[PDB]
Coordinates of C-alpha atoms and ligand atoms in Angstrom, one line a residue:
X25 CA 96.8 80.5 98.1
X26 CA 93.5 80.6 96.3
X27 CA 92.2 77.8 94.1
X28 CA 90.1 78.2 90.9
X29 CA 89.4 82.1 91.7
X30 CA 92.8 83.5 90.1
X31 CA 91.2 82.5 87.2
X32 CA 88.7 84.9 87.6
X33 CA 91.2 87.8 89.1
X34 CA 93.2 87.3 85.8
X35 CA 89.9 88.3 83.7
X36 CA 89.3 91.1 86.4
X37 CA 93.0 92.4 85.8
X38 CA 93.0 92.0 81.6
X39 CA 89.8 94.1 81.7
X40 CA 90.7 97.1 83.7
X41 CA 93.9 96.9 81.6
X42 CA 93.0 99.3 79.3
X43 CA 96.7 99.4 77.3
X44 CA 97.2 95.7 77.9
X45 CA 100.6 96.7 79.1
X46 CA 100.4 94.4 82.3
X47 CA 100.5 97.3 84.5
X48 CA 97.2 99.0 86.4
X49 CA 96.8 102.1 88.3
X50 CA 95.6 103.2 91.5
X51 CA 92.4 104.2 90.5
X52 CA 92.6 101.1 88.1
X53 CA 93.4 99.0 91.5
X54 CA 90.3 99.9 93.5
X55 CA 87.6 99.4 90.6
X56 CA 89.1 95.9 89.9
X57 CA 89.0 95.3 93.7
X58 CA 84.9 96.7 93.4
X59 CA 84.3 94.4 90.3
X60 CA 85.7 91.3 92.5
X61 CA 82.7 92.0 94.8
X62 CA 85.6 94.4 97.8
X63 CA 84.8 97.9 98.7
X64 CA 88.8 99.3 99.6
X65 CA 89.0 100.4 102.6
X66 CA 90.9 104.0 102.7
X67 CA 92.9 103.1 105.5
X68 CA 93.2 99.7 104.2
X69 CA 95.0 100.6 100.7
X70 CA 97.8 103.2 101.7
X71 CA 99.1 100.2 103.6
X72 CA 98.7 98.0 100.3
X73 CA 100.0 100.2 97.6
X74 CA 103.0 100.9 100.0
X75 CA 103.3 97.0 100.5
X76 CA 103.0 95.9 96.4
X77 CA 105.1 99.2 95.4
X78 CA 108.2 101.3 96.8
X79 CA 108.9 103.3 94.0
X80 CA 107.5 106.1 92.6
X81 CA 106.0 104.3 89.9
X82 CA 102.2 103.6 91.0
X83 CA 102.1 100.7 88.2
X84 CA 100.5 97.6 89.6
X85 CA 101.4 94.3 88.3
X86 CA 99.4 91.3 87.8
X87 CA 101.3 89.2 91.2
X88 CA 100.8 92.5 93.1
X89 CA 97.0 92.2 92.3
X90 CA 97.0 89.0 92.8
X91 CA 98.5 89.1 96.4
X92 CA 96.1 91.8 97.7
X93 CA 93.0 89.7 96.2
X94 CA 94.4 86.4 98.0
X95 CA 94.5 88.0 101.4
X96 CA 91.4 89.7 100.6
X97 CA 89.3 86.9 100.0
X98 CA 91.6 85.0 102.8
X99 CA 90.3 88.3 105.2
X100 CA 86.7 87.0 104.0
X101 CA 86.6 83.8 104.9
X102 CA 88.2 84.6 108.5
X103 CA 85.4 87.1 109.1
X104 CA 82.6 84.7 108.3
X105 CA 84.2 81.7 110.6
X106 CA 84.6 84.0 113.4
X107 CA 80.9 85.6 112.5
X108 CA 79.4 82.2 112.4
X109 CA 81.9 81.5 116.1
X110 CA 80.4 84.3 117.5
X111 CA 76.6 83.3 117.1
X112 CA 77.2 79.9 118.8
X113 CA 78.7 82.0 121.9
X114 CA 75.8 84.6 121.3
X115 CA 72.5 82.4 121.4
X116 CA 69.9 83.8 122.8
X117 CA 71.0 86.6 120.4
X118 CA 71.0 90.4 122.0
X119 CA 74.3 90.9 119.9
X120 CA 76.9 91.0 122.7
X121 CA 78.1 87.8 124.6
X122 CA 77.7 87.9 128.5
X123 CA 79.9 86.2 131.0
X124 CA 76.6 83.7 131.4
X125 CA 76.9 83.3 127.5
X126 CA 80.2 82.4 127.4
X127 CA 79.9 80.1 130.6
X128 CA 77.3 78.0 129.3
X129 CA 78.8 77.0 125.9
X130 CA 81.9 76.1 127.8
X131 CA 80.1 74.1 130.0
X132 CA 78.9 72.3 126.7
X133 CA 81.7 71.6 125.1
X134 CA 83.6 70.5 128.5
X135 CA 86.0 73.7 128.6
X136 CA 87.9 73.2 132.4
X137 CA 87.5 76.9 133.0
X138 CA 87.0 78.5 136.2
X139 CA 84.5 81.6 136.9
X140 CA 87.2 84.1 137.1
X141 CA 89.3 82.3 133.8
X142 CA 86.4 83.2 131.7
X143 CA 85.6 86.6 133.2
X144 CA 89.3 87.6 132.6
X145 CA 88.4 86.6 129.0
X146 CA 85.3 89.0 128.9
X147 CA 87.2 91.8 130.2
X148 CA 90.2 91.5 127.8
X149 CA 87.9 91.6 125.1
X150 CA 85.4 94.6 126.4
X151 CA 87.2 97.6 124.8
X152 CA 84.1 100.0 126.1
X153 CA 83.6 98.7 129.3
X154 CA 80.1 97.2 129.3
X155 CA 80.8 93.9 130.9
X156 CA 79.3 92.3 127.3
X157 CA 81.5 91.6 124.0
X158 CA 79.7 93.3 121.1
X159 CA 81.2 91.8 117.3
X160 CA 83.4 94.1 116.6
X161 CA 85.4 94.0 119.5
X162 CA 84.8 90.1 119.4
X163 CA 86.3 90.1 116.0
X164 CA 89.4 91.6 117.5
X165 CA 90.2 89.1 119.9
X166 CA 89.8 86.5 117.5
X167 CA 92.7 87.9 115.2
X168 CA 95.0 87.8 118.0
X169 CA 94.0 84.3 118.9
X170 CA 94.3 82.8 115.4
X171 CA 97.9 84.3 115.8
X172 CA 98.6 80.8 118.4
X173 CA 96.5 78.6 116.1
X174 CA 98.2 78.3 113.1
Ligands
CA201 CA1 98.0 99.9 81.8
CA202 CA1 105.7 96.0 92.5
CA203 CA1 73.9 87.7 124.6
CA204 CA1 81.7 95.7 125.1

């Protein structure tokens, strides 16, 4: 749920609204999105417009628009937690966290794992095979991990 924002996605939505019918478009969806500060992502929104509408309508309503912005800014605020996770694992900042990286901060914070625990967790992680874990592949991991917190 968002807070004081679906104020703001309400003006967003009455604007694009040219007829004031209650109903956007497609091309009504994505320039609303774009004036909310989101770039759609192409692969992104066939999964969205399928999710919001079955029929062979392509009308948008405002609870439709108001789900895709909630997980959107929701999507947001994930990225940027595990963004700022990743620099505290990443500090002396090359952009990929080593096995010496990741040993270090969990010697820090007094994590009980073994040498070979936290390789394991390297390798899981390394989609291209270069021992490191660059941000993108890091920001993978981390949507499958948030999956057993909460
Ligand atoms: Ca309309
Ligand atoms: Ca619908
Ligand atoms: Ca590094
Ligand atoms: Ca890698």
């Amino acid at each position: 749920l968002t807070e004081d924002q679906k104020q703001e996605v309400r003006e967003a939505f009455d604007l694009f609204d040219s007829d004031g019918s209650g109903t956007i478009d497609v091309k009504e969806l994505k320039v609303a999105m774009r004036a909310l500060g989101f770039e759609p992502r192409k692969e992104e929104m066939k999964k969205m417009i399928s999710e919001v509408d079955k029929e062979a309508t392509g009308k948008i309503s405002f609870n439709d628009f108001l789900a895709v912005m909630t997980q959107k800014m929701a999507e947001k605020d994930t990225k940027e937690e595990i963004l700022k996770a990743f620099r505290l694992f990443d500090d002396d900042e090359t952009g990929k966290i080593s096995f010496k990286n990741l040993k270090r901060v969990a010697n820090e914070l007094g994590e009980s794992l073994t040498d070979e625990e936290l390789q394991e967790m390297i390798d899981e992680a390394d989609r291209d095979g270069d021992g490191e874990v660059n941000e993108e592949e890091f920001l993978k991991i981390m949507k499958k991990t948030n999956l057993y917190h909460h």
